[PDB]
Amino acid sequence: KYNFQTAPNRLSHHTYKWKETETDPQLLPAWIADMDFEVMPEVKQAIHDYAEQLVYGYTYASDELLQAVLDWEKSEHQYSFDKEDIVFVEGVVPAISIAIQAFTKEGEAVLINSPVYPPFARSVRLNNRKLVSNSLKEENGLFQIDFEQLENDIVENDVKLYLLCNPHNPGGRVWEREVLEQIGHLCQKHHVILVSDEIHQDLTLFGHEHVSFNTVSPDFKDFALVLSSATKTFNIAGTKNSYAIIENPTLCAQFKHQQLVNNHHEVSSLGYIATETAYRYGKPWLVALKAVLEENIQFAVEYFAQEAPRLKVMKPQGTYLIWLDFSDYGLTDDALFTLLHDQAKVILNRGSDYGSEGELHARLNIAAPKSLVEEICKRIVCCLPK
Amino acid sequence: SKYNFQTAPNRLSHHTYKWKETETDPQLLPAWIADMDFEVMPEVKQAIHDYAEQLVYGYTYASDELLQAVLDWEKSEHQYSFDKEDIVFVEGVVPAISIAIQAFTKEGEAVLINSPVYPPFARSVRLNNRKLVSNSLKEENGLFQIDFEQLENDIVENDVKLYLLCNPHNPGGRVWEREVLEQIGHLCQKHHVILVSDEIHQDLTLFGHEHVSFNTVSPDFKDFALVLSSATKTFNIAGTKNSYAIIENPTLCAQFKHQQLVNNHHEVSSLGYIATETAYRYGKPWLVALKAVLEENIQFAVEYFAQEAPRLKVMKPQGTYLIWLDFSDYGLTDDALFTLLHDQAKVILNRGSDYGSEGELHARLNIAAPKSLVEEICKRIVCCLPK
Ligand SMILES: *Cc1c(COP(=O)(O)O)cnc(C)c1O
């Protein structure tokens, strides 16, 4: 029914992902987090229906779009809230910057769990806030929080804001309810505001269940907000819409005020349309996708185990992204990436972008047809040094 | 012609700002917010269909083709030559204004506007905790003019750091002469002011009036000035969300781009990119046609008001599709003027007082609609005006 077998040709679309391939046709990309899968058919139709409006002027977020978000959140994540708790933002990374600027002052400390999505550290640093990197443990193939050190990091730096990634990118760690509750209790104790980046929430796999942060405790809304989107779930990043759910009146007003100060309050018409459409029609597409992602991940894990046993592979609990550790090889980061790029002809995300814990790591995107994922894994193991 | 300026597409199901009230009260005729009730040029519609047919709607970048289109537009239309590297895309011009305020001034510092002017000018200054300096425009012989003596006083007395210029000026539709802009630039050089020229209406000058892009006035002006513009007002594509800054000075360009990234306001949607390139590539004949329709609508309005409401003082635009109306000769308050227009005449105009104190007892009228709609709106405006 849905096509997860053939990858639409993207070379002519000015994509980030395929940019290098436009000049060097032998490069295969598997880095930036979008998919080489056709998007659900109803979004395509919604774009055609937009063209047929004939006039492309100024629009606002409808009651139907607000209801679609409420309905998705309740039905998928058991998170019940009011339409007025929703704030639309053209992207989640924009929302992170707005939250930093609203909820902290210059020089105050913002904590992250490293290694993590590079715009977290970037946005803190560029905003002239103190970055506190709470280093994740790695135990038995999974990231885990050191709660003793996390508390030390909060107290020793007077942390004002915690940027949480859940599911955590990279690694694809789907935090248990009990882990989130311990995090929230630290924030309550130490008077920390928390932003939960839950953009990957719909992509938990292998029986792992997303727990949205404010569902953990009814008091968590007093200090925490949730960011999510339809874009990673449904491969519609180019449509530019996302949302913050901010139930606390003071937090909500502060975020919205800062958004307006920055004139960052407006969203494109297709931004609105694609999100409403994706949530209304996307459940069966997403079910079918998850089966394909699980198969690609299982394939990659087994292939790597057989062809490059020295390569340490973190199996995701969610997301379509695999965190690869080349630390057992006699390499530098520069030699690793020259090797992958110039010899293997594959483009992966550089692990050192995610923090010092990502040195000698790469991140591999498996959201593409299995035939492409097979080729990418073959390239990755081809030229690894003895 | 080949192009439809005769029939207004039905926008009631599109969640537009402009027609929102009419969806509940179908008697209401809107003529306020600046988008048009004309079909967009066909090549844009086709390009949206072509985007759907990409099939995957992932992350995209601004192409060399888009960069070249913007360069070619500026050169061809406005005699403004610069490098592809001088272009900065921003999802809107109002976004760019806030980025510029944050980049080029610090909290507490003074930003100057010519009042009355586009309300987001004053809003963006105030909400950013900068000092607003409102240099009040003169009105002489039916046109806004700058009082240069007072403009200099306002800069000096307030240590003005940044001047937000509107050119063409909204409201009123004043298409500033090269010589006016020369004098403004000289003041900025003298007093060390950075100038942001909002030229979003630049393609919509009319009746022989020609837009003069700020940095074309003198080759040194880009040392302190930058230009904001867009395809969106010109081509009625505001919902596609793209615009640009032209920033030739390396320091100013880096400062703007840095603030933009600090704010994570550096990304633009795929249709943002596509619709702008398309409009600039194919839009010239459509714009020639639009401008004839706009001139005929404005001429109609001026003449109709002269006959039916000679007490109504009408500023004839030199550009833009917006007319500034002065009801000052009527025995009215602002609140009573707008209840009269909205509740009794069933027409929605922009409230003049939104633009500054100088706009008290004024309203702004949007005539970018088919002539028949414009005729009705004008009829309603004069229907209910008090003795
Ligand atoms: C991809 C990603 C984002 C991207 O957000 P935009 O909405 O495209 O700005 C945000 N957070 C994480 C953790 C991501 O992986």
Ligand SMILES: *Cc1c(COP(=O)(O)O)cnc(C)c1O
């Ligand atoms: C309409 C208008 C804008 C609107 O800009 P966006 O690009 O839609 O943010 C900006 N400046 C002036 C003077 C306008 O009239």
